[PDB]
Ligand binder design. Structure first.
Ligand SMILES: OC[C@H](Cc1ccc(F)cc1)Nc1ncnc2[nH]ccc12
Ligand SMILES: [Cl-]
Length: 167
């Protein structure tokens, strides 16, 4: 039993809800919130910009130190950093950004990072401003993640479309 509320169950382990991931994280304070990161951990827009804003830029400050020490992430890769006021940990995961010409096959590799954590609150990787098809992202999520994932989503119209088309 966990404290996630109001989710629709898609499979044994995948759940989905129309929700603002920032507000969800503040309410639940999950062990792990997933950020839709880029390789530079520059949290400008989309989910990343919103999560970072909610931390009063502390996420960005921590991220800049991480990059200065370690260099950029790989597309498809991840790192674990603090969750600040939102969660215990933030798993920064880099899905491919179609608006940059990155290979969509890397979306499965990106979701594989979720399997290192028993329970996660997460967005659909590569969706939104990353330019991939969200129906595809949900399919890859369901077919790749084996741990318990609670997907938030932002766009109410999109949420209804995702549920109705789910196979
Ligand atoms: O896949 C991640 C989605 C992409 C998206 C956004 C808007 C649309 F109209 C259609 C797709 N973004 C978010 N999901 C959950 N919580 C969020 N908080 C702030 C942004 C955000
Ligand atoms: Cl987005």
């Amino acid at each position: 039993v966990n404290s996630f509320s109001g989710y629709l169950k898609l499979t044994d382990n995948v759940y989905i809800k129309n929700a603002d991931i920032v507000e969800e994280a503040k309410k639940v304070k999950p062990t792990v919130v997933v950020n839709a990161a880029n390789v530079y951990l520059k949290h400008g827009g989309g989910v990343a910009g919103a999560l970072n804003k909610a931390t009063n830029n502390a996420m960005q400050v921590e991220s800049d130190d991480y990059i200065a020490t370690n260099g950029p992430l790989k597309v498809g890769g991840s790192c674990v950093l603090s969750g600040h006021n939102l969660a215990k940990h933030c798993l920064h995961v880099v899905g491919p950004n179609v608006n940059k010409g990155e290979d969509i096959q890397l979306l499965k590799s990106a979701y594989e990072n979720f399997n290192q954590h028993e329970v996660l609150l997460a967005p659909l990787l590569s969706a939104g401003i990353f330019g991939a098809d969200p129906i595809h992202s949900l399919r890859v999520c369901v077919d790749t993640v084996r741990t318990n994932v609670y997907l938030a989503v932002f766009d109410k119209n999109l949420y209804d479309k995702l549920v109705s088309s789910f196979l």
